[PDB]
Amino acid sequence: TLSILVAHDLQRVIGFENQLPWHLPNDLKHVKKLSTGHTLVMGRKTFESIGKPLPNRRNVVLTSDTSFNVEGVDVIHSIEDIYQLPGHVFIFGGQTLYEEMIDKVDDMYITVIEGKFRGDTFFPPYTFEDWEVASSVEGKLDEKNTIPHTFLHLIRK
Numbered sequence: 406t407l408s409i410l411v412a413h414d415l416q417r418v419i420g421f422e423n424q425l426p427w428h429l430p431n432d433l434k435h436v437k438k439l440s441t442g443h444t445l446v447m448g449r450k451t452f453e454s455i456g457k458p459l460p461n462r463r464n465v466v467l468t469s470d471t472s473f474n475v476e477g478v479d480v481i482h483s484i485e486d487i488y489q490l491p492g493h494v495f496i497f498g499g500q501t502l503y504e505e506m507i508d509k510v511d512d513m514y515i516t517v518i519e520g521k522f523r524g525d526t527f528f529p530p531y532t533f534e535d536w537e538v539a540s541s542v543e544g545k546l547d548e549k550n551t552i553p554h555t556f557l558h559l560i561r562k
């Protein structure tokens with residue numbers, strides 16, 4: 406498959422100053438579970454955010470920098486190289502990847518954070534006319550997980 410994996414808030418904020426606007430361990434665990442043993446594609450900025458590869462999956466970074474060579478990372482330099490990777494590919498971030506990818510992907514694993522954050526980056530506006538709710542599951546709250554959130558899985562109609 407080719408999937409978006411994203412958390413965005415009630416106004417489609419994904420990002421502030423090159424970080425998540427929220428502490429939400431449960432969603433990062435969601436990320437682990439979904440993506441372990443699989444492939445992530447991310448833009449250069451998001452990779453700098455994470456700061457190195459995530460273990461136990463394939464890590465692929467899209468970048469115009471031809472001198473990019475990072476232990477444990479496969480570089481690519483066009484959107485088109487994505488379509489050639491084997492297996493289940495998660496589009497991992499960030500804003501620009503989602504923009505370039507969102508009409509191309511089979512489905513999306515969105516976490517909706519039921520808050521309003523300050524952001525400087527956003528998820529593309531989308532319509533539920535275009536997208537079927539394969540599943541919607543309320544995130545569980547504790548002290549360590551204190552924002553309401555819902556895990557959507559959408560498939561292109």
Ligand SMILES: NC(=O)c1ccc[n+]([C@@H]2O[C@H](COP(=O)([O-])OP(=O)(O)OC[C@H]3O[C@@H](n4cnc5c(N)ncnc54)[C@H](OP(=O)(O)O)[C@@H]3O)[C@@H](O)[C@H]2O)c1
Nearest residue numbers: 411412419420423424448449450451468469498499500501
């Ligand atoms: N909420 C979430 O689920 C989530 C997940 C990840 C990231 N984020 C957020 O997203 C924001 C980052 O988004 P962003 O748009 O600024 O950055 P980004 O998408 O992570 O990275 C963009 C970079 O990717 C490379 N790139 C993108 N398209 C390319 C193409 N077609 N050909 C060659 N290279 C290409 C370029 O790198 P070069 O300049 O090196 O060429 C470009 O500057 C941050 O705020 C971060 O916190 C949110």
Ligand SMILES: COc1cc(Cc2cnc(N)nc2N)c2c(c1OC)O[C@@H](C1CC1)C=C2
Nearest residue numbers: 410411412424425433436454455497498516
């Ligand atoms: C933009 O920053 C991040 C994006 C992301 C990507 C990300 C996060 N959350 C969701 N729902 N989708 C995503 N694509 C992550 C992330 C980020 O901060 C390091 O943390 C890591 C944990 C520490 C290893 C995991 C994911």
